[PDB]
Amino acid sequence: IEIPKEVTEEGKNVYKKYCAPCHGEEGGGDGLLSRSMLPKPRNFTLGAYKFRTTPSGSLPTDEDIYRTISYGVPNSTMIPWDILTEEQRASVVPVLKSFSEAFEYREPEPSVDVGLPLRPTERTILAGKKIYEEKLECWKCHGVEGRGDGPSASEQEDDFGFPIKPFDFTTGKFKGGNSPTDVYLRFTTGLNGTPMPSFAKELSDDERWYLTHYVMSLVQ
């Protein structure tokens, strides 16, 4: 439904009861249970969201945040919050936005246009294999099979100073969603706060569908 811009008392309470234990009382990702948690809960104060429909460096839209709250983040303790009502999940969006000054000064960039997903073929997969292994050498961080055991894997770090070793995605549980549109979105938007950049500039729309098709090919 409609996500408010205003902060409400209900929004404070929902965050307090269901989000503060991990993300912290002030959204610093420093709840008590964050000391022993891996991956670390998001520090909302930086305004850096991994999963957006906006280009690299931009803030998330209010709908981007509501989507992540509803769907959750696989390969982490970030469960789906479908257990909460539509309004409850929408009332905490401004609470998360109030943790970062960047939301008050800049406006989120326009959402990218997905377009029509290209038909996967033997041709598109091999064109993505070429990009993955030769043109951009994604096996550096992710490995030849995408297991997350490449040479540069163990040394990767957040912009928050935390180790972010790329998880094995051959299970098919992508953090932003396991849809072909979801994976294409990640390559078109980039993951803010992580060494995983946007390839909207290095590759065309068609080439990122080629790359998406090969990435899905690595799933079991």
Partner 1 sequence: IPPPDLYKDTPAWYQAVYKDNVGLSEGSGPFTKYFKAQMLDMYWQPNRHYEPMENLDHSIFIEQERRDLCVICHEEATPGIVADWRSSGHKHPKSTPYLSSKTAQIEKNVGRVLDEVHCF
At which residue do the structure tokens 């469960």 appear? 79
Residue 50 annotated as part of some ligand binding site: yes
Contacts for 104 with CB less than 8 Å, ≥ 6 apart: none
Q: What separation in angstroms does the CA of 50 have from each of 46, 71, 86, 118, 145?
A: 12, 14, 22, 24, 23
At closest approach, how far in Å is the CB of 117 from a second copy?
Answer: 7
According to the binding rule CB under 6 A, does residue 176 interact with ligand HEC? yes
8 A C-beta contact, residue 32 and residue 21: yes
57 is in an annotated binding site: no
* Ligand-binding site membership of 160 (annotated): no
Site string for a second copy, 74-103 (x = CB under 8 A): x-----x-x---------------------
Q: Which is nearer to partner 1, 30 or 63 (CB)?
A: 30
Nearest residue to 75 via CA among 104, 46, 40: 40
Q: Which stretch binds ligand HEC (CB under 6 A): 3-11, 43-51, 103-111, 119-127?
A: 43-51
Half-sphere exposure of 144 (CA within 13 A, CB side): 0
Is 83 near partner 1 (CB under 8 A)?
Answer: yes
CA distance 143 to 168: 9
CB of 142 to ligand HEC, least distance (A): 5
16 is in an annotated binding site: no
141 among annotated binding-site residues: yes
| Binding interface with a second copy (CB under 8 A) | 67, 70-72, 74, 80, 82, 116-120, 177-181
